Design a protein around this ligand. Structure first.
Ligand SMILES: *Cc1c(COP(=O)(O)O)cnc(C)c1O
Ligand SMILES: *Cc1c(COP(=O)(O)O)cnc(C)c1O
Ligand SMILES: [K+]
Lengths: 470, 467
C-alpha cells in the first residue's frame, strides 16, 4: 500500500533542503527580526496591482460589464494569492491556494482510490512527464510506450537512461488504443521479444484522446491494464492534457450539466483504480487555459511527490509565482473555483465538439472518402483526428506517405505524418499510413471546411496519379 | 578560438528539434491542421493592466500603468495572442533583444559570437551552466563559501567541487589569489587523483555570502589563469548592479557616471573566445516570484543549453515574459529607463547597508573588538565577523552563539552552512551573513543590529556560553 519499491535509486538518493540540541535555558523570541534570507522586501517590487480582463466564452469579441479580476499587493482571503507573496520566493511545490485548488479539482473529477496522495505544481505536461520519467526510471530501465506517442516524452525517458519499448496500437474504429492481445503477449513472452532487456519498470499511456491516434481507453480496458500493472509490478504514467474535452460521436452538423458530465461523459483516471500509488497522473493548463502559462500539476503518492520535489530543486526551481498568482485568482474569483472552472471546460467542449464534427463532415463529403482512399477514426476526446490513407498493402508505406506529404504541402494543408511520432520507425512502419489532424488552431469554420477540402483534394489527385506527385 | 572543447560531452551529445519531387511549388498561404495548440480565441484572458510604483516603498498625476492587449504590431512588445501561446524555448524575441541591448550597455562582451537565452532565474542559469561545462568526473572550482544550491547542480552533472580559499581582510577581492595560483600550479600535490579543473564558479561582485567584489585588475589575473589552465568561468551576478559607496556615518548618480565609474566590469568584457558564461536574474532587481532571468555566452554554449532546456525546463512562463518585457518597454522605455529603476533601488540598498553598519559600529560588541564587519561594495550581504579566541572550537562556539542570537530575536545565516567542505573552511567560519534586503523600514534595521550586537556582547560577557 505504498510505491517506495518503484521510486528510482537516482530520485530516492537526492537529499532534502540549527539541528543539534538547544542549550538548557533556550527560549525562542516571540517576534524575531530576520537578517537571514536573501529576499527583497515586497516594497522593492515594481508591480503594485494587476487587473486581469477576461472573456465569458471562447471567441468573445470585446449590456454586461467585462469580467475583470483585481490582484492587490495584500489579501487575507486564503483562496487567493496576493502580489506580496506571489512576487516573493515561494515553496518549490507551489503556492498553497493553487495546490488546494488542484486537490479539490482532482477530488471532484478523478478521486484516487487511496488516501496518501498529493499534488505538485509543474511548468506543464512535458515538465510533469520529465518529473515522472526521473522518479520511476533508473539508468538501464525499460519503459513501455505507445508505438505512436508524444515524441518529446522519449527525450525525458532517454534523459533517465531508460529504453523505450513500443506497445502496438489497434487501429480498428472501436479500438481502445493499445492492442490488449499484443500487450498481454509482450508481457507474458517478454524473454522471447527482448532477451537482453530487463522487465518493464513503467507504462506511459495517453489513455484518453491518445496523441496522436485520438483513441480513448474504456473503464474496463483500464481495469485490465491496471491488473497487468500489479501482476508485472510496473508503474503507470498517465498523461491527460485534454481528457476533459469529451466529444459525442459524429452526427451531421447543421446544455450538459456538471453531475451528468462527471458521471457519464468523463472516463475514469487510472488514479480511480490505484490503491498503492503506482499511478502518477500528469495534468496541464496548456490546453484548457493557455500553453504560454507553462503551468500544470502532477498527482501521485506522497513519497513519489517528495522525490519529485528534490528533483525540481535541481533542474526546475518552481513554476512562475506571477503565473500561479494570475491563474489561481482568475479560477477562484472569476470562475468561483472547481465547478465554475468545469463550466468553462464545458463551454470549450462545445466548440471542440462542433470543430471535430465539421472537419469530419468536410472529409465524409469528399470524393477521396466516398472512393475509400481515406478514412477517419472518430475521436472520443481532445483535439486530434487519425486520418487513414488506404494505400495498397504491397506499396512502401514510408515512401508513399512522404510523397503524399509533399502533395498536401503543394495543396496548402499542413499535417503531421504518423511516422514522425513513433518510438521505433521499423516496428511501426506498417501502421504509419496516417496523418494526425488538429482542429484546435483554425480561426473559424471556413478554415476547417477549407482544410478538409485541400486535404482530401490532395489525396484524391495523389491516388488518381497512381500514387505519384505528377 | 572558441569554447567548443569546453562544452561537456553530455551537453554536446543532445540532438536538436527527403528530396522534394520535380515540379514542387509550396502553396502561397497554407492552412495548418498540424500544430497541436489552441487558437488564442480559447484563452480566458483578453487583456491585462499592470499597475506600477514610481519608486521602491511608494504607497498608493495618475498611477503608472501598462495595457497588455491581445494584439500588437510594436516589435518591442509581446501581445497575449503570442505571449499565452507556445513559443520558442529560448524566449520571446522582444525579451531576448532587451537582454542583448541591456548587456551591450552594461557589460559588452569582447567578442562577436555571443548570444542570450531566457531562463527561470539565476539557479536555473547556474544548473544550465553546470550541465553545459561539467562531464561525469570533472572538477569545478567553487569559492569555499558560496551559494550552496550550486553544489546540487554541480553534483547533478557528476562534478567534484574543489573549494578556493577566500581572503577575509577588509580590503579583500574575495578569492585569495596567492592560494588560487598555488592550487593551480601544484594541482597534483593538493589532488593527485582529480583531473585538472574544468571550470570556476565565482560570484565576483557582492559575493554570497562574504559580499566581496573582485577589482578589474583581479578579474584580469583570474581570466589569464582561466586561459593558461583552460577552464570556463561561470560568472553569477544577481546584484552587481547595486553598487554601494563605502561606509559614511548616516543621517543622484547619472547613468554614464554609474556605467563608466561605479559598475565593476563583467568577465564578459575580458572574454575574447567565449570561455565565460554570465548568469543574470530578474529576482533581485524586479521580483523573485517572476522565476525569470537570462544567461550570456558563446553561440555554441547557448545551443547546447537549448537542447538541455528541451529535456528538463521547456521555457520561462510566456505570460511572465510578456509582463516583464512590456513593463520594461512601455513603463521604463527600455535599457536606460530600467537602469534608472536600478539606480533608485541602489540608493535604498546603500542607505540600508550604512544603517546596519552604523547600528554595529555604535555597539559595545564592536567597541570591545568582539565583532567586525566587511563593508560590501555591492549587493545585499554583510560578513559579520566574531573574534573568537584562536584556540576555541569555531564550530562549537558559533553554534552556541547562533542559539543566543535566536533567543535575542535576530535570525542570521552561519558561514559554516554555506561551505563546499566544512573541515577545509572551519577556521574561517567565525562569521554570520547579514541581509538588509528583507526589512520593512529603518527601525527594523537598527533594532536588528542592536539585538545582534547585544546577543554577541552577552555571549562574550558569559565567557562564550549561553548562560
Ligand atoms: C500537448 C501535449 C503535451 C505537452 O503539454 P505542455 O503543457 O505544453 O507541456 C503532453 N502530452 C500530450 C499527449 C500533449 O498532447
Ligand atoms: C539569490 C541568488 C541566486 C539565485 O537567484 P534566483 O534568480 O532566485 O534563482 C543565485 N546566486 C546568488 C549568488 C544569489 O544571491
Ligand atoms: K475491434
Amino acid at each position: 500500500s505504498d510505491p517506495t519499491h518503484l521510486i528510482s535509486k537516482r530520485a530516492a538518493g537526492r537529499t532534502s533542503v540549527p539541528s543539534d540540541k538547544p542549550p538548557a535555558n533556550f527560549k525562542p523570541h516571540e517576534k524575531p527580526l530576520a537578517l537571514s534570507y536573501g529576499m527583497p522586501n515586497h516594497g522593492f517590487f515594481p508591480i503594485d496591482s494587476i487587473d486581469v480582463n477576461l472573456v465569458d466564452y471562447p471567441f468573445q469579441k470585446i449590456h454586461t460589464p467585462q469580467s475583470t479580476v483585481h490582484i492587490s499587493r495584500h489579501t487575507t482571503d486564503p483562496k487567493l494569492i496576493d502580489l506580496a507573496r506571489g512576487l516573493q520566493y515561494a515553496a518549490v511545490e507551489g503556492h498553497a491556494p493553487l495546490l488546494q485548488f488542484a486537490r479539490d479539482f482532482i477530488i471532484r473529477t478523478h478521486k484516487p482510490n487511496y488516501d496518501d496522495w498529493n499534488v505538485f505544481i509543474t511548468t506543464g505536461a512535458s515538465d510533469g512527464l520529465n518529473k515522472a520519467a526521473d522518479v520511476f526510471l533508473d539508468d538501464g530501465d525499460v519503459i513501455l510506450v505507445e508505438e505512436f506517442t508524444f515524441s518529446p516524452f522519449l527525450r525525458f525517458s532517454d534523459n533517465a537512461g531508460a529504453k523505450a519499448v513500443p506497445v502496438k496500437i489497434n487501429f480498428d474504429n472501436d479500438s481502445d488504443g493499445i492492442d490488449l492481445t499484443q500487450f498481454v503477449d509482450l508481457l507474458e513472452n517478454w524473454e522471447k521479444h527482448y532477451p537482453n532487456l530487463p522487465k518493464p519498470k513503467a507504462l506511459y499511456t495517453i489513455a484518453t484522446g491518445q496523441n496522436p491516434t485520438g483513441f480513448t481507453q474504456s473503464l474496463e480496458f483500464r481495469k485490465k491494464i491496471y491488473d497487468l500493472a500489479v501482476k508485472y509490478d510496473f508503474a503507470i504514467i498517465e498523461d491527460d492534457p485534454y481528457g476533459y474535452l469529451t466529444l459525442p460521436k459524429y452526427e451531421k452538423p447543421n446544455d450538459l450539466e456538471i453531475d451528468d458530465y462527471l458521471k457519464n461523459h468523463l472516463t475514469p483516471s487510472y488514479l480511480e483504480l490505484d490503491t498503492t500509488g503506482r499511478v502518477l497522473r500528469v495534468e496541464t493548463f496548456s490546453k484548457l487555459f493557455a500553453p504560454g502559462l507553462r503551468l500544470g500539476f502532477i498527482v501521485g503518492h506522497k513519497e513519489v511527490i517528495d522525490a519529485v520535489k528534490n528533483y525540481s530543486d535541481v533542474v526546475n526551481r518552481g513554476a512562475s509565482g506571477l503565473t500561479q498568482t494570475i491563474v489561481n485568482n482568475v479560477i477562484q474569483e472569476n470562475f468561483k473555483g472547481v465547478d465554475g472552472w468545469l463550466e468553462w471546460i464545458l463551454k470549450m467542449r462545445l466548440n471542440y465538439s462542433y470543430r471535430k464534427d465539421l472537419l469530419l463532415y468536410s472529409i465524409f463529403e469528399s470524393q477521396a472518402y466516398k472512393k475509400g482512399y481515406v478514412d477517419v477514426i472518430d475521436p472520443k476526446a481532445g483535439m486530434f483526428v487519425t486520418f487513414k490513407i488506404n494505400l495498397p498493402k504491397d506499396v512502401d508505406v514510408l515512401q508513399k506517405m512522404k510523397l503524399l506529404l509533399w502533395k498536401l504541402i503543394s495543396y496548402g494543408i499542413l499535417v503531421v505524418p504518423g511516422y514522425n511520432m513513433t518510438v521505433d520507425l521499423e516496428f511501426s512502419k506498417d501502421r504509419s499510413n496516417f496523418f494526425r489532424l488538429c482542429y484546435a488552431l483554425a480561426n473559424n469554420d471556413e478554415e476547417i471546411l477549407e482544410s478538409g477540402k485541400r486535404l482530401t483534394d490532395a489525396v484524391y489527385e495523389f491516388f488518381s496519379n497512381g500514387l505519384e506527385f505528377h
